[PDB]
């Protein structure tokens, strides 16, 4: 049986309706559950859902430089393939192995429904409005690194703005876009924006394409005989249509707005 | 020296002003000339750009089962590299290992300018301006596989519409598009319509945001030393953004428009 490593995160992995009188990978809905059931079929094995333990993704501790979250799991031989919102990166492809991408998404605009915003040049050409993103992570960096005119001046705007435009948690920055009588736009991961615009009270949106590309992508300890067929797996999945009908089905068919 | 199959393909790889009076790597110029540098750079090899000689991206021959193309250069031992606008697919994965997408890219709506059609879904709702793609290919497939509503409506009518709206070739389809009195919309990758959109005579542009997500990535043969290092350095290079930064430079500050 394959240990899979995954995390407990609207809509790709949730508790169902009754899992308490339920058993094993009955517990558990969404997204990444029906994908990790696509994959074992097309891999021809038996698996074993298990939630992380300490609800993280996977990042080097600052002090030990030992890996949390899935990541962790997957180096240090407690789980066989992680199947989650997991981003591909740099610093993790250093350490395991990433199929190709089973979801693209990107840096997107947030606004609260009303704002007179509908492209990131429209922001950055103003200050009326204010916007940011968390305080670390990804989404800022792209900013700071970023040669292209348009978000080197959002960069700009954002390092000095006062009072902070940089937020702690994904949740305030969305209470931050909700709250502030339209003066708050909020940066942030298009899957995350677009999950948000779908649930109630529907008075949120994404604005403009996204600013970006990534990727998730389902991860295999280093040496794993399960890498190669994974990555088949993703790619014949895409090409078949089943992953653009399983983002449907999670974000549209289930939402409330 | 590192032999680097690529293909004569613009804005990828053109031929140099004055390359008659160049040698070797200094003939060429463009965006995958630029990334060839950056790669062999990161990884630390010397390298020979050579262009392949059918001119061709990589497809098994229908009678022999034979790859062709930039394919055929890697899985038939006469390039180590491929660095190209290749696209990341199932059957080429099956014979050949692809770094992680360098370029992100979808499917998407080319229109003459003045065209009153500013979506896809709106594209679906009627008929007086047909629309359509290649004749074969994975722009056709998608439409046909797809499961998603307004997909399904464009497959529908496309595939039973006439005259027929499936051209042979791209610049059939954008001739279609300049000379039908803006009665034709084209279905295609949208690098490539971004790219006319920005040459002479400027009459086109892309609408709608991309329908689909594909990716380019560098290839390498099975078992290649190359593999690991040419992956993390794609990774770095997207991650620092110079990967956008090149985008710009070959798609808008080379533009016309
Ligand atoms: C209650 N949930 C949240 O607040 C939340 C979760 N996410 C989210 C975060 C990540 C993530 O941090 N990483 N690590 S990273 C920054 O790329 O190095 C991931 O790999 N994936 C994530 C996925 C999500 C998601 F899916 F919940 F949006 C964003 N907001
Ligand atoms: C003169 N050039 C053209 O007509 C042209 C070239 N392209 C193009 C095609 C491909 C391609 O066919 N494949 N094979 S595939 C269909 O994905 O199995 C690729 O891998 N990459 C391609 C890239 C281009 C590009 F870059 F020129 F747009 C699209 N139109």
């Not at 970023?146 to 700009?156: E, L, N, P, Q, R």
């Not at 403009?208 to 067929?229: E, H, Q």
Request: hydrophobic share 35%; glycine share 8%.
């Amino acid at each position: 049986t394959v240990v899979v490593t995954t995390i407990l995160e609207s809509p790709y992995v949730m508790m169902k309706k009754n899992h308490e009188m339920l058993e094993g990978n009955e517990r558990y809905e969404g997204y990444c559950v029906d994908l990790a059931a696509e994959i074992a079929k097309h891999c021809g094995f038996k698996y074993k859902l298990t939630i992380v333990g300490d609800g993280k993704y996977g990042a080097r501790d600052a002090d030990t430089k030992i890996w949390n979250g899935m990541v962790g799991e997957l180096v240090y031989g407690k789980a066989d393939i992680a199947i989650a919102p997991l981003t591909i990166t740099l610093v993790r492809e250093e350490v395991i192995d990433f199929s190709k991408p089973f979801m693209s998404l990107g840096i997107s605009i947030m606004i609260k429904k009303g704002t007179p915003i509908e492209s990131a040049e429209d922001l950055s050409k103003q200050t009326e409005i204010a916007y940011g993103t968390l305080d670390s992570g990804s989404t800022k960096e792209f900013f700071r690194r970023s040669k292209i005119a348009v978000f080197d001046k959002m960069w700009t705007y954002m390092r000095s703005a006062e009072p902070s435009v940089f937020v702690r948690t994904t949740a305030e920055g969305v209470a931050r876009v909700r709250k502030s009588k339209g003066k708050y736009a909020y940066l942030l991961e298009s899957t995350m924006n677009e999950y948000i615009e779908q649930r109630k009270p529907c008075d949120t949106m994404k604005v403009g394409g996204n600013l970006d590309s990534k990727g998730y992508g389902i991860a295999t300890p280093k040496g794993s005989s399960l890498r190669n067929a994974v990555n088949l797996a993703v790619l014949k999945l895409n090409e078949q249509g089943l992953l653009d009908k399983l983002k449907n089905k999670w974000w549209y068919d289930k939402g409330e707005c």
